Amino acid sequence: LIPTDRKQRLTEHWEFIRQDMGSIWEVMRPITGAGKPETVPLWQKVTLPHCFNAEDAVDPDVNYYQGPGWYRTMLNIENPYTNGRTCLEFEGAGQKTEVYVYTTRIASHVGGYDEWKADITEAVEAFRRTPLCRERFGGKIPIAIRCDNSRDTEMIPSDMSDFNLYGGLYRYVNLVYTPAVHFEQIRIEATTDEKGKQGSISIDIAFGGLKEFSLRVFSPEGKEVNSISSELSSYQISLKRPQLWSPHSPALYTCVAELIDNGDTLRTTQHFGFRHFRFEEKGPFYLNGERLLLRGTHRHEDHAGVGAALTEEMMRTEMQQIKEMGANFIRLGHYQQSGIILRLCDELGLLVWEEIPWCRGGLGGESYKNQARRMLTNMIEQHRNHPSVILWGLGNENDWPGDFQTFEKDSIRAFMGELHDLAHRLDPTRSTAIRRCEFCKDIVDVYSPTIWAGWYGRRFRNYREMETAGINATTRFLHAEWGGDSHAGRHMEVNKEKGIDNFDIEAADRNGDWSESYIIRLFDWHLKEQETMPRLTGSLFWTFKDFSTPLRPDNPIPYVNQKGVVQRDGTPKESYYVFQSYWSSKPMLHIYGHSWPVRWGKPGEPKEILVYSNCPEVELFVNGVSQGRKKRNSQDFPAAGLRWNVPLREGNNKITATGYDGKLRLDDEIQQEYQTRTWGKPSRILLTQTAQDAETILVQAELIDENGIRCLDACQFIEFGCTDSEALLRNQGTAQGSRRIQAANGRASIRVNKQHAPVVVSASDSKRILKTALISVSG
């Protein structure tokens, strides 16, 4: 990662093909004529970032592609510094990568997630001394990059992992010029006492190549705190009463380094923050001396339609959405993530646990270990400036065997100790962590076991017991990963009849209906319990967003881990507002059931209604009749005391809530049908055009019994087809962008691109027991 503020993202005018080529010459050779043998195979025009698996990760019928691919482009290289260096900078590419200038290989890399670079200065110059350069390419420089994500047992992470080992140039590639002498590494170590009285900055600058260079520090308010003019170094300064960075107040200082030479100015701007943190033995966690409850989530480098190839603008939206939920903490999946995410965590205010991808499978040979050592090193060195980061993780579920014939707790223990020592040698400032490896729990500073209350183990009401069992089983405890799957749009009516009700069950993984109705209770319970555990460090629920995993072909959305509170395209589930009503300080108000169109029960039966709100008082209205203004109280489960039991008319009902917080008044409204007719087994599929959009039409399939009652119970897979194989929005991994998807209360919908109309859309049950239904979509 070159330190400079001037960089060009290479996003346009790339070609890509998803296979290996016969040689670099085959990649580079000229085309002698149309239809000649070298004009196949065909390449694709693509824009970067690009991912091999943008679609096939969630395609229900194929294994996501794991193999080589090539990219190529023509670059206009104009290094404006005399004797300047020219680099291609990779913010991230998976999994193995080779870089060529014309026919000469420049650099190679193993590792999907660290940053690295390729100095092309010499190859470029050499290419310019040949006639081919201007006679054939007209000045430009031919560049080719091979990316490979073939299965490799000796490379981390393990394919046993519960996520995709994406291939491609899925993080930005930058063209970077520097002058002859330039910055190579700017390390900023800010320290402060737990009370914030004394601050100490400490800047180490490593130059490349080998007149004065300046160094300025700025306060969060832009005030030049101090300047240094020096000469070609390390450096340390005291500060009294430094403004402290916290999730609540993510205040950031700035360090500016300038090299001036030949009248041009190499500048690099960087941010850092002062904060103190402590993981109390057998106790909670303190940030700048005050106990803080870590309210944590996870994210993967994954998104609908793009696989790993997210843009900056997408990352901003998502991180902003996570901040508005009220999180103050996040574990960045199982690998180093985009520098854009880290900078967002510094800017918005989220503490960070970032780990290397030693994730399941056991332990490999020497290059395996060297990748781990290298990636830990790269992660620490590339990210250490970020105030947000407080944990360096060393591995995840390393107790999970299977990638080798042997599994050796002693060898794993030894290597884990080596990594712990390397992290502390490299960055004393922070603590180490692993998750779920009982026989290494002592090696690290902060341990997380596996605790999935009500999902994989026990009932969610056993959380507090299991949590304290964990706090007592380890020196320093953090709870990484809890929650459970919900099929967005599936709901379930409470049935107060061998358990407190139908939601009070053990291990909903294999006993639950994967409805939002259940998980909303489970999240709710956990967050209530957390209000009365003053010695808990905190926890991180897995996970923020539905994401693709190769391990779940048969999930309600195939190949999608559905443990988000938000769909894979960012569309919030109703559980999102559960977290938001407990954790956010911005007043909000959400009636549960915006995505619940039809409720059921016997005629005149009073129906439960839950509101999730951080307002202290909310009044609810049913069909215009106030049902009473109630007061928020987290202990009155569920919904923190904001629940009613109201009668519903057969057919439509209008449900309304008004929220009060001081002078502020909030409002929300849903409409729901109430169905008193009971239903038999599904008998027909009804296709409806629900209409939707200036560019999209929403098609709904409906499972009904022989007398025409919707089967609000039905979970059958439904499959969509179409006379135009590009009209359906498919392979998104979402509720309305999947071609095969389990019904949600006997219902399944899919979007149709309007510009492709007119077409015919078909809907079938996957088991092919019902008759296929057809609908004409005109536009």
Added chain:
Amino acid sequence: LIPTDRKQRLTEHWEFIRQDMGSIWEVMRPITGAGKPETVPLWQKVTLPHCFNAEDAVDPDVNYYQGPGWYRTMLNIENPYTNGRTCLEFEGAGQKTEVYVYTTRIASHVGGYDEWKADITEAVEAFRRTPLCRERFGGKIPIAIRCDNSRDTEMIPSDMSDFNLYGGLYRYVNLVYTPAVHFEQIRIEATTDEKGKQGSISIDIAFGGLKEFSLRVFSPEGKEVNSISSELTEISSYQISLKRPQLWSPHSPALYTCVAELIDNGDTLRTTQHFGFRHFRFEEKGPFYLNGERLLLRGTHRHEDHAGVGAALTEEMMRTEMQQIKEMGANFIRLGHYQQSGIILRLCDELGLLVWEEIPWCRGGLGGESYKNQARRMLTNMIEQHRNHPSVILWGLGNENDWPGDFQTFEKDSIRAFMGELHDLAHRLDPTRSTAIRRCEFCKDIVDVYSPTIWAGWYGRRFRNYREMETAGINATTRFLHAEWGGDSHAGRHMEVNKEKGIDNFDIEAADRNGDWSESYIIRLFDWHLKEQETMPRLTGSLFWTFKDFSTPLRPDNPIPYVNQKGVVQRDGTPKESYYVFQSYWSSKPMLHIYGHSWPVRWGKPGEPKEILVYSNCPEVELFVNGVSQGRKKRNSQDFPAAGLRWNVPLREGNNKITATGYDGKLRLDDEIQQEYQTRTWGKPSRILLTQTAQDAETILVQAELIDENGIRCLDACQFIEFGCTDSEALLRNQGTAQGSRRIQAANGRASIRVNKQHAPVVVSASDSKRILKTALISVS
């Protein structure tokens, strides 16, 4: 390839996945529980032979897959011999292959077209001496095979070739047991003079391992002609005498048999070998003589390619196809650009087809040492593995080696040098046969027999220029043989003759770029060539390219995408009407074919007399139109076209019945077609109409029709048309055929696709690929 009559084809219970795996352990590791991480990726249950590109070779929207894939299965290994040896035998696998017993690699191979084996004897043993054999697999043996057809410019053939470099175990794999001492090689050289007075049989036998052994030679009738017993020595040689032997020829493929037999521990190792007595000669500046008589070689080619299977042809499929060729009247075949399945060689021996077989040094230039060693190795394997076949008279050393591009250099002198090394290697290995190459003028003097490139009427000049170009080619080389000629035709596309810059609209230059790819054109081109060959006494012969439409990666935009359409039959073996042009000239079996069985709508002015051609080898043929006899006519090859069997006839608007009767002595032969005659002319295409014309118990045929704005069929429309379906598996697609293609150019305003009956009801859509017409739909009951 081990000589024993006792071997087992492993066709059942294989698993396959089209990607590399993370290690051989990952292939072999056990399943710990349903849904556990090692449950993915998912594998396919397949039956061998199997090909990576069974469908995607001709899928119009993808590059055919070029990469690794894995097979795995469980074998009961019951070797019935004391210290016997167990081998997996590969009759062919592409392109690179690696063989594993459990986690141990056995053998590896580079080359997709020669035979090779892997001796698994010691690994099976060392594996049985482990507890996992009994505990986990219950005494059976786990086998895995990695095949790879990644692009590799240092591997022959070149990806510039006009065929797919297919991947997978597309030829049979055999489990084979032999004794500790066994036959390794059995070479049989039958020699006879050009009039068949005497015969000599030299027999060389090599043994692996290291008492006596037996050797019997049986006539083509089963009668023992000669017998020997001899002491077992590592290499042996025997020469047997024989008076006026039965001669092998295409017309009369008399085959002798040699049976070798070895006994130990009571068990009898036997191997049976066929061979043939024949004498042949390529005359300098002259023709070709078989058993003392000049014989005009009537040749074709075939690729190891077929609809729905890529290279994974079964033995039954090969029987059907070779018979179809023999019945066409060919006597000669060049087996594509590579060694082909031994089943094809046996069929050539048995039906009577002379053979040119070459190594896949095919385009691109010349690579490094590994590349050169592969060519030396495959030439060696091809000759050693097929030399006992009497059908084989020509070893080819390469094809279009003047085509550069796979490397930055192209060194004619280095190519000459390596070509000359290969010629010497072949003549050293097998002095009894001639070397050939095709299209490399700067090497043409090196080999025994040479073919230039000559495509009169297709890639150059007019088809009427054929004799002149053929004579030029015969004058320009010591021994000449015309390999490759003909041209593409879109099955079911035709064109009315028009006499208004040439003789008629079919008298054109270089139809590849200038023609309409109709059957009408190519039929005349084949007709002309064939009638010219009757007046060329110096011509050894030719091989037209090619028998059957086959997939090629080089033609994304062909009327059938990715299909080379120069066959006289479709990729599924459905005959085009050009198949009968050849048959009428070459077959001795009486036949009669009115041209136009696949031509449903003729056109022209009202009452205008319309031409009808008939392709028959019957001496006399009478045509009837609508019951009215049009005259008995005598067959005369030189009376072009249709050898004089042609009539001009009135057709009425509407349906017309056209019948023909041919007379061969007392054989009355009959044929009949019906055709509509359309006198209305047409504007540009404007609507697509769908209809169904299903006549099978399994399939419905759906037809798209391009019509003008007044409802008139556009009878010269060639637009690409695309099919879709509410059920993505109902359409019979990716076949490379006229009715099994998702996208295909219209054939006189018409395109059709088969629909699977079981999947009905569905809705089929048809569009012009350019999207200027509105999409059509039809519901299929």
